[PDB]
Design a protein around this ligand. Structure first.
Ligand code: F43
Ligand SMILES: C[C@@H](OP(=O)(O)O)[C@H](NC(=O)/C=C\CCCCSSCCS(=O)(=O)O)C(=O)O
Lengths: 47, 194, 296, 259, 221, 251, 351, 114, 55, 93, 50
């Protein structure tokens, strides 16, 4: 997982490109093209 | 096993053969741990899906308060192109009564677009973690799509100070909730409470 | 002097009626607006009863005579579980509410079982803090007969159970056992009315004993004075911020933080600490006020 | 010629109905709402921008020669080609100045090219947008036909024509388009007629006093003017019913001798 | 038992698919009548009236005492007898439905069709028809004129239901007289209203015909 | 218990049954046997549900409705709006009433078999739509069959409404079309909020629930007088299309 | 009325009418009757006399609850759109267990509302929510009962149960008085107005009371509907509102069609039904029409309204639904204590 | 379903019959169960509830939910036997062997019920 | 009409009974029907009496 | 002071139970829906499934065409047979 | 051929949400004859259990 990659949300299937990683509260978060934080454990890499 | 005393409401129910609760009323369970929020005192919410969760929590050993919203039916006025049919809202006294509890359990219906905006308006003034009990399969994230704080899917611009802490699907309005749903709710309350 | 009734009318021009009640010296104990109708529990002097009836019929209102709208009742269920709480217990509480009383569900910690049932001292005192206690028992004669130690309080008592007739040394109302449906059949309604009649008779007897030696000030006017003086009573989030008991009041504010303010309230020319017993309540650390009689 | 009466009866309700039906009776105006404010509450177009068109102007389009069709002068909104819009009102049963069937009859008697529809708790009139705005401001909103408390311009959710009034004497609204400002005593429309909020609330005046409502209402009530106090209207209704029955039985001059 | 996906058509539908017995001729919709006459107002009115009244003759309605009323209705509503429709339209070029009602009542009074029944205590001299069928014909001609006036003012065809309904209402409560077809016209106008003005509405006024459950109630008026 | 002594079943009267050996019945291509009484349509719930599923099916095309919404009504139509409409119709079709608690509604457990589905020959619109309530032609049919069906259907969108079985049980088969049309109209005027007038709403209603309706069966005339969606009105080709074995078998 | 004739009542299983439609019942009964005839009398299994039996049982001697509706309506027999008002009046059995004419008419009103407005117009020709509050307005609270009892008292104080012959003047008097009283009651008691919030509910209740009063005064059902229509057009002027637009179609054509003699418009109210051309679209009229038709005969103390065979057949104690007290049975069903037939749990797996 | 209660208390029999009926209705278990017999022994606190189902694990879970609903609160020590007939004994005391023998007697009696 | 047998198979409406003499006045009824149905004068309109006015 | 997020309570009357005329039972409005009320469904079912057949022409044909004598004993036997055949029992074949 | 008369019916009845799967009618009739078919339209929640 890195900026410019393609990821999809397992629960629904929303396709988007990773914009940035913004850790907060000693926890990793992932920002997608829809300006929504996600969790790395709930995201996986697709090609 | 400890004594559980409930502050019954000060007003009577809906007629003779009707419900026992009244709209816009609050029943404190002394020690404030969980508050169950019912949209209305009608048969679609009261004693079929709500008092069952209440007695499940009270059986788990956690004191429970039940609050019936004055205007719990409909969609908020901030919904796209306004509301239709009826307007959903939360009173400041209702918000204060909710905010003195450790956790909140709220029962929602079947239409997602209604549930997401109702939860957003509810959490605009509620700052404690809440559990959404609905019938339809809704995802933790569609709430974050409109700017609701969510444990797994945070929004970039949070428009609410309350955290949707768990979503439980499969509880139908006006129907007896099976023991499995009550067990799931109790486990979620315990593992997001203490 | 101050007969307490319930007015059921609309919210339109209700403020003028409230102004009339204030003018004639009445007090609005309870107010609730559902959508467009307002229910008001009002205490007005007996010499203005017919005047208020005329005024109510001008607004197309309804006067309901509430024989229990001055007392708070402790409804003692063995537990708050699905067996007793969501049905029967709520029916008892709501039927009590229908006649003006303020109920409190008392779910015993160890109230269930036949020989393993017990009642704690704290629960005992909490029950005694009320005016009258209603016990919702099961539907087996032997189980109830082997459970008499639960009903040991020096408070008026009404015991409800399944069997039609019991041989306990207390007042008993039959055909109200542990059920799972809403009480709507004719027999169940009749049994509820019988329980209401028994509690009404006990309350009237206690009212007569109190009237033998009346208190220095009525509880309702004392509540009105406290509301006028104490400015923290409108910040209370409890269902009933001040409960009007038979011979006192229950103020739902912290005792450690507000007992000195409550005691140093001047009613007429007396200080409240010299005419009432202000004490901490077992109920969520609230303030309990017990009025003294004119004898002392 | 024929000097038209408009309604039977001698009570104040019958006189008010006659006044509403009379096109030569100048309705007393009780407020001043600017045209742009009326347009904003209506919620169809943004004030200051041009009207949207449904067809080219009538001069541009070509029609066949029709002597009878060309005898009628069209509306200006029709001449330009504007979309047909609507304005809807809900009237309380508690002495609202205008009532659904009364509104529809007055609209069809006073306005040109209008489409009026009557429901128990609803009344809507449709017309070309420019003319619709014109007579909405001139007649529907500024005159005695409108009371901001007992009546309300509202589409979408209409409910409360039969419910009791709230603490301020206002009709029940499930969407709360208009609220009562106690500081100034005026009713302000916080939403347009369909339910989307307005950026700036519009002052529509203050509620009409109930004494004036008793005098200007067009509804019959037991507490107000009852139909038993107006036997002339009942007689005319019964005559209409009997004439309908006799005509439906056998429509001859002999069967109408028993009229 | 019909021609659904075929490429052969006729103006009359299958006799097994009629609303009632003798309803075959009330199957041509308004749009067909308008297109056949090339959007000529008077010719389309004449076509529709001729078809409707011939159908009423076929249904057995225009038999005995009702034949005169249906003949007068045809003559005065479709064929512009005595030039009533054109006269009312000319007199109400800038007018409304109420003005058309006023002109109709004035013409009926001047022609002796209606007279004053009695004057009530609160004024309102009641009117009774000296000629019931002729009054119905005059009211039908005025109804056509009012529809023409309102829909030429709006230049839209969505006003028909309201115009007919409230023309009849205003006339009835103005004179104390029955409307066109003794309330059947008003009932059919209510049918038009709920058929073409809501989500439980269906279609527009162009597909109106007498062979429908909603629009069968008026016998060609 | 129930009949209070009135006889119901008396094998002793009539023919003496079982004089010969009552044979069991196999079922072709299946390795299971059953008695002949189990194959009676009244004793077999499978046959009853076979008829129920066909009876409660109405297919309505939604392309005229979308075009009327876009042009006449001035409302944009997007895949998100289509998803919202599908949510609304799925809630409202069985017994639901949208944002109206005061309205009486059917018990949800009583209509668990009611669904509203969508399919389209437009591939991009198909993959832009929610898969919760979409009938995917590409993943349900083989490639050549899917191509042929997409070519035959075109680039149009259709919605399938499965009225609950109880409605067909209580009423007749002609109730299904009216139920579907009413619920479709309610869901359309709720999802898409339109500030146009009511005549325009009538045109939209025609375009949305009376323009491209496909019924399973036609009404029957004369002595077979019946409504639509009855088994006597189902053509042989329609029933051949109902059965889906061309999907999973090449024999 | 019946005479020295023998009749057989066949009640086929409810599951048959639930799986199939209502046109199955007559054919089912005919086949089973033929089989029982050929096997009970030891006849040949198939000859000319068998065809005679089949024709007799299929059409010559059969009585259907509802006629078929071919053509536009497109419905089979034994559907709620084919049941005439007199047939439904004869179905209700309150006449043989009670002597109160208003109670009999009101039980028929309740049955007619629950059948027509709720099933036939709610689902057969509509969908979704249907019309529950439109029909329950006539049998939930005593509003209609109070109005009907006032109408009966007013009629008995000045006319009597059959003291006058049906004329226009008595229709106007009774209908106007009852309508004025009902609207005054709506004005005086806000609880009644908020109970019947919709104008259609109110109009139907007031007009039903007026028609019942006219029927109790004259004993004629057509006079009853005439009074109903006068009540509707008087309500319209009293409150300046009637109902939803589309409600008063038949009410505007009613006065003319009530006493009409033309082919498409004439029918005695007992012979009218949901297939009557004016009555064939709108809710809030048909159940009250059936009640008015029943009240036309409850005034005379008649044993039946249209068909004695239907009355005797539905007097059967073995019916699952008790037609003597329809409102009590509806209440029992609403409280989940009514045992209904047609269920198939012996042929279904355990859930 | 068939509901019968074996108790020497008149009011308890009817009230617990209504309780069993209501618990069956709430879980929608009436058509999936043939017989439901409850033996009430209150002098020595123990109750027996037997279930004979018509003809998976979810159905068993619903049946145990039914037992939990019907059984009195104080009887917390419970044990069940399942051999196509589910029978459970609930008491506030540890379960004795005679109670289990009564449970198997009820189970065998329910098996031959037809 | 004499027995109120309106309705169809086995149907009677009590109270709706008319006592007329159609068979006796058959000639007058036929003459009135002929007058009503006649178009002008010489059309082929005929109402013949059958079975002594019974038909 | 105007807070647009308070909402408007609605449908207070519809929450109260509905009495039934001439009875003493109170029920919810949702339970009076024809789909949710088994009593209304059975009311329609009983009317739908009822057919009355006049068994006089059949007796006359049995008497005059087939020469079979019809007596009350034969009618009792026929009733016994049809109560078995009408639900779907087998009599021949 | 992919269809016989109507492509829309063929696609509509391929829906997996149907209670009766029309892919194998014989197998489902066999299942129903064994009382193992879960049919719809049962009013179990509005009827008494006794
Ligand atoms: C909400 C709507 C939208 C529409 O298209 N029809 C509605 C709603 C619709 C839906 C409700 C379900 C839903 O999800 O919408 C259904 C069930 C349609 C149907 N299949 O019969 C219905 N109404 Ni309506 N509808 C009713 C009624 C009413 C009364 C309400 C009067 C008031 O002022 O409150 C008025 C009609 C009138 O004005 O006379 C009314 C209107 C309206 N009704 C307008 C009003 C808003 C609009 O302008 O769009 N109903 C009633 O009067 C009671 C019976 C009730 C019907 C259901 C029942 O019988 O249980 C329901 C009947
Ligand atoms: C023939 C048909 O009318 P249509 O041809 O205009 O659809 C006829 N009536 C309908 O419009 C259809 C359904 C009944 C709906 C009436 C509901 S009354 S509640 C809504 C009031 S409002 O929507 O007008 O405000 C029917 O099918 O019964």
């Amino acid at each position: 997982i890195e900026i410019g990659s393609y990821v999809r949300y397992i629960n629904t299937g929303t396709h988007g490109t990773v914009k940035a990683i913004e850790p907060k509260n000693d926890e990793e978060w992932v920002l997608l093209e829809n300006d929504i934080y996600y969790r790395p454990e709930l995201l996986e890499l697709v090609e | 096993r400890k004594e559980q005393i409930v502050d019954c409401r000060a007003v009577m129910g809906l007629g003779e053969g009707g419900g026992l609760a009244q709209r816009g009323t609050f029943a404190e369970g002394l020690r404030n741990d969980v508050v169950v929020v019912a949209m209305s005192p009608g048969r679609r919410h009261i004693t079929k899906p709500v008092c069952e969760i209440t007695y499940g929590i009270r059986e788990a050993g956690i004191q429970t308060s039940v609050l019936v919203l004055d205007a719990g039916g409909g969609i908020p006025s901030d919904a796209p192109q306004g509301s239709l049919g009826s307007t959903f809202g939360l009173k400041p006294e209702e918000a204060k009564q909710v905010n003195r509890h450790k956790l909140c359990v709220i029962h929602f219906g079947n239409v997602k677009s209604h549930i997401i905006y109702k939860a957003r308006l509810f959490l605009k003034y509620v700052d404690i973690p809440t559990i959404i009990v609905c019938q339809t399969p809704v995802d933790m994230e569609d709430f974050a799509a409109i700017g609701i704080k969510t444990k797994n899917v945070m929004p970039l611009e949070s428009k609410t100070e309350g955290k949707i802490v768990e979503i439980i699907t499969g509880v139908i309005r006006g129907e007896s909730a099976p023991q499995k749903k009550i067990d799931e709710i109790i486990e979620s309350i315990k593992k997001h409470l203490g | 002097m101050y007969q307490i009734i319930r007015y059921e009318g609309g919210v339109y021009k209700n403020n003028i009626l409230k102004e009339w009640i204030e003018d004639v010296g009445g007090f609005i104990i309870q107010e609730h607006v559902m959508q467009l109708d307002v229910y008001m529990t009002i205490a007005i002097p007996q010499n203005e009863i017919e005047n208020f009836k005329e005024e109510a019929k001008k607004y197309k209102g309804k006067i309901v005579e509430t024989p229990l709208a001055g007392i708070e009742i402790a409804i003692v269920s063995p537990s708050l579980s699905r067996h007793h709480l969501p049905h029967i217990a709520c029916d008892v509480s709501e039927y009590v509410r229908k006649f003006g009383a303020k109920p409190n569900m008392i779910g015993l910690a160890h109230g269930a079982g036949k020989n393993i049932s017990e009642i704690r001292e704290k629960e005992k005192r909490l029950i005694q803090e009320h005016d009258i206690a209603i016990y919702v028992m099961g539907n087996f004669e032997s189980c109830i007969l082997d459970k008499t130690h639960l009903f040991k309080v020096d408070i008026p008592l009404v015991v409800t159970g399944g069997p039609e007739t019991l041989d306990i040394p207390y007042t008993y109302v039959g055909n109200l056992g542990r059920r799972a449906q809403r009480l709507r059949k004719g027999e169940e309604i009749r049994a509820l009315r019988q329980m209401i009649d028994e509690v009404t008779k006990k309350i009237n007897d206690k009212r007569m004993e109190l009237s033998y030696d009346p208190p220095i000030i009525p509880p309702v006017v004392l509540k009105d004075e406290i509301e006028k003086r104490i400015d923290e009573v409108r910040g209370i989030l409890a269902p009933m911020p001040i409960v009007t008991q038979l011979d006192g009041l229950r103020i739902k504010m912290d005792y450690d933080r507000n007992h000195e303010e409550i005691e140093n309230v001047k009613i007429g020319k007396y200080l409240l600490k010299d005419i009432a017993y202000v004490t901490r309540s077992e109920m969520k650390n609230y303030i309990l006020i017990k009025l003294k009689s004119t004898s002392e | 010629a024929y000097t038209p009466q408009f309604y039977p009866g001698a009570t104040k309700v019958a006189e008010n109905r006659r006044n509403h039906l009379n096109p030569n009776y100048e309705l007393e105006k009780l407020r001043e709402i600017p045209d742009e404010d009326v347009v904003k509450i209506m919620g169809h177009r943004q004030p200051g921008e041009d009207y949207k068109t449904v067809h080219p102007p009538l001069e541009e389009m070509d029609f066949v020669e029709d002597y009878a069709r060309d005898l009628v002068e069209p509306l200006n909104g029709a001449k330009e080609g504007h979309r047909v819009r609507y304005i809807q009102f809900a009237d309380s049963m508690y002495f609202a100045p205008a009532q659904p069937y009364d509104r529809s009859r007055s609209y069809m008697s006073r306005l040109r090219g209008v489409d009026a529809g009557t429901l128990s708790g609803r009344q809507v009139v449709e017309c070309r947008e420019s003319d619709l705005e014109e007579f909405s401001k001139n007649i529907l909103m500024d005159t005695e036909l409108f009371d901001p408390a007992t009546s309300g311009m509202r589409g979408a959710t209409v409910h409360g024509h039969s419910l009791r009034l709230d603490e301020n004497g206002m009709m029940f609204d499930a969407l709360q388009r208009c609220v009562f400002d106690e500081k100034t005593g005026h009713v302000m429309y916080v939403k347009d007629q369909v339910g989307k909020p307005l950026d700036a609330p519009v002052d529509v005046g203050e509620p009409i006093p109930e004494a004036k409502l008793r005098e200007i209402t067009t509804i019959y009530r037991n507490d107000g003017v009852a139909m038993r106090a107006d036997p002339d209207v009942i007689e005319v209704v019964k005559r209409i019913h009997r004439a309908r029955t006799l005509g439906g039985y056998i429509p001859t001059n002999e069967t109408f001798k028993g009229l | 038992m019909d021609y659904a996906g075929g490429n052969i058509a006729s103006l009359l539908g299958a006799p097994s698919m009629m609303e009632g017995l003798g309803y075959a001729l009330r199957n041509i919709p308004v749009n067909h009548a308008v297109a056949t006459t090339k959007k000529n107002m008077m010719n389309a009115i004449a076509f529709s009236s001729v078809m409707e009244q011939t159908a009423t003759f076929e249904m057995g309605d225009a038999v005995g005492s009702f034949e005169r009323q249906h003949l007068l209705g045809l003559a005065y509503q479709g064929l512009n007898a005595d030039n009533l429709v054109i006269d009312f339209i000319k007199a109400n070029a800038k007018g409304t439905v109420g003005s058309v009602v006023e002109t109709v009542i004035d013409r009926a009074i001047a022609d002796g069709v209606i007279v004053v029944d009695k004057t009530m205590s609160s004024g309102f001299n009641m009117y009774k028809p000296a000629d019931v069928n002729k009054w119905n014909a005059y009211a039908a001609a005025g109804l056509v004129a009012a529809v023409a006036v309102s829909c030429g003012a709006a230049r839209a065809a969505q006003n028909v239901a309201s115009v007919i309904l409230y023309f009849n209402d205003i006339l009835e409560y103005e004179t104390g007289l029955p409307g066109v077809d003794y309330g059947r016209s008003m009932g059919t106008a209510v049918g038009f209203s709920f058929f073409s003005h809501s989500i439980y509405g269906g279609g527009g006024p162009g597909i109106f015909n007498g062979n429908h459950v909603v629009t069968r109630h008026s016998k060609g008026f | 218990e129930k009949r209070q002594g009135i006889p119901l079943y008396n094998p002793d009267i009539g023919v003496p049954l079982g004089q010969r050996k009552l044979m069991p019945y196999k079922l072709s291509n299946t390795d299971d046997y059953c008695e002949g009484d189990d194959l009676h349509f009244l004793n077999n719930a499978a046959i009853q549900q076979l008829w129920d599923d066909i009876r409660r099916t109405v297919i309505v095309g939604m392309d005229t409705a979308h075009s009327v919404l876009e042009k006449r009504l001035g409302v944009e139509v997007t895949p998100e709006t289509i998803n919202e409409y599908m949510h609304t119709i799925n809630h409202s079709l069985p017994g639901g009433a949208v944002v109206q608690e005061h309205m009486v509604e059917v018990h949800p457990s009583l209509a668990w078999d009611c669904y509203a589905r969508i399919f389209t020959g437009d591939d991009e619109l198909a993959d832009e739509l929610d898969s919760r309530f979409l009938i995917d032609i590409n993943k349900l049919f083989p490639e050549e069959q899917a191509e042929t069906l997409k070519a035959a259907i075109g680039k149009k969108t259709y919605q399938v409404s499965r009225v609950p079985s109880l409605v067909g049980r209580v009423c007749d088969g002609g109730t299904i079309s009216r139920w579907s049309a009413m619920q479709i109209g309610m869901s359309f005027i709720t999802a898409y909020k339109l500030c146009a007038g009511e005549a325009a709403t009538a045109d939209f209603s025609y375009a949305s629930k009376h323009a491209d309706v496909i019924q399973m069966g036609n009404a029957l005339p004369g002595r077979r007088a019946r409504g639509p969606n009855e088994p006597g009105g189902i053509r042989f080709g329609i029933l051949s299309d109902v059965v889906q074995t061309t999907r999973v078998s090449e024999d | 009325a019946i005479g020295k004739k023998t009749y057989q009542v066949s009640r086929v299983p409810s599951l048959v009418g639930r799986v199939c439609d209502g046109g199955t019942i007559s054919r089912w009964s005919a086949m089973q009757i033929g089989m029982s005839f050929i096997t009970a009398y030891k006849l040949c299994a198939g000859e000319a006399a068998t065809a005679d039996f089949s024709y007799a049982s299929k059409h010559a001697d059969v009585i259907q609850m509802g006629n078929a509706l071919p053509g536009r309506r497109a419905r089979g027999p034994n559907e709620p759109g084919g049941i005439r008002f007199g047939i439904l009046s004869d179905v209700v059995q309150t006449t043989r267990v009670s002597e109160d004419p208003v109670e009999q008419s009101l039980e028929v009103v309740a049955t007619g509302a629950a059948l027509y407005d709720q099933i036939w117009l709610g689902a057969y020709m509509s969908g979704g929510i249907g019309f529950t509050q439109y029909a329950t307005a006539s049998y939930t609270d005593d509003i209609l009962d109070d109005f009907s009892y006032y109408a009966l008292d007013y009629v008995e104080k000045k006319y009597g149960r059959m003291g006058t012959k049906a004329t226009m003047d008595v229709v106007e008097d009774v209908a106007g008085e009852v309508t004025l009283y009902a609207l005054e009651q709506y004005d005086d008691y806000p609880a009644l107005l908020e109970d019947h919030f919709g104008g259609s509910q109110r109009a139907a209740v007031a007009a039903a009371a007026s028609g019942i009063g006219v029927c109790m005064a004259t004993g004629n059902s057509n006079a009853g509907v005439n009074g109903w229509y006068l009540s509707q057009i008087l309500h319209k002027e009293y409150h300046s509102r009637l109902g939803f637009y589309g409600y008063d179609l038949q009410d505007q054509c009613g006065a003319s069609n009530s006493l009409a003699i033309r082919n498409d418009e004439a029918a005695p109210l007992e012979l009218r039904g949901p297939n009557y051309p004016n009555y064939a679209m709108n809710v809030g009229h048909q159940g009250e029409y059936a009640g008015i038709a029943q009240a036309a005969h409850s005034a005379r103390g008649d044993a039946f309204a249209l068909n004695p065979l239907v009355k005797v057949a539905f007097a059967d104690p073995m019916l699952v639904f008790d037609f003597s007290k329809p409102r009590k049975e509806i209440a029992r069903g609403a409280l989940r204590e009514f045992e209904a037939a047609g269920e198939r749990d012996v042929i279904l797996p355990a859930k | 379903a068939y509901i019968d209660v074996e108790c020497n208390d008149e009011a308890g029999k009817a009230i617990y019959e209504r309780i069993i009926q209501t618990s069956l209705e709430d879980l929608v278990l009436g058509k999936s169960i043939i017989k439901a017999k409850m033996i009430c022994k209150q002098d020595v606190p123990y109750f027996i509830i037997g279930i004979l189902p018509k003809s998976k694990e979810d159905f068993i879970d619903r049946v145990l939910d039914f037992m939990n609903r019907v059984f009195p609160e104080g009887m917390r020590i419970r044990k069940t036997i399942r051999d196509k007939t589910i029978v459970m004994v609930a008491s506030e005391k540890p379960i004795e062997e005679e109670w289990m023998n009564e449970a198997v007697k009820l189970q065998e009696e329910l098996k031959i019920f037809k | 009409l004499a027995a109120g047998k309106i309705g169809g198979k086995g149907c009677q409406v009590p109270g709706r009974t008319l006592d007329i003499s159609a068979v006796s006045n058959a000639q007058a009824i036929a003459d009135e029907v002929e007058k009503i149905l006649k178009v002008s004068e010489d059309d082929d309109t005929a109402v013949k009496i059958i079975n002594g006015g019974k038909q």
